[PDB]
Amino acid sequence: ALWQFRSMIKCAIPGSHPLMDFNNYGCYCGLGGSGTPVDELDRCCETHDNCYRDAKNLDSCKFLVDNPYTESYSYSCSNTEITCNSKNNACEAFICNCDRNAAICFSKAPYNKEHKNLDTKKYC
């Protein structure tokens, strides 16, 4: 889940908006835009999309509804660091593995908070 990994992304970042620091950042980060990224940090957003989708196809989840942003979450947060769920099949826990390894790209990565806000011309 996206709104549900977001609440813990704004603990991951000491922080404020879990996206919008990302929605408009390079090309897209997390939410918005289309194509390919800019940063190492923006690469976990090319793939929080490429391993975010596949919940639709899944070994455990293959029907109608869950396509871009929805399945998981039942978490925590410490310093900055959380957990993910407390239930699991792949349906929730596979989607949770790309969400939390994106809270690890998104709290930390080879970060740059620098090309925020962008335009998608120079940027994408």
Contact set with Ca ion (CB under 5 A): 28, 45, 49
> Minimum distance from CB of 34 to Ca ion (Å)?
8
Q: How far is the CB of 32 from Ca ion (least distance, A)?
A: 7
111 is in an annotated binding site: no
Going by C-alpha positions, the residue among 83, 60, 82 that lies closest to residue 71 is 60
Is 99 an active-site residue? yes
Is 33 among the annotated ligand-binding positions? no
Catalytic residue, from 21, 39, 42, 48: name it: 48
| 59 annotated to bind ligand | no
Cα 105 from chain centroid?
Answer: 9
C-beta separation of 116 from 25 below 8 A: yes
Alpha carbon distance 61, 15 (integer Å) = 33
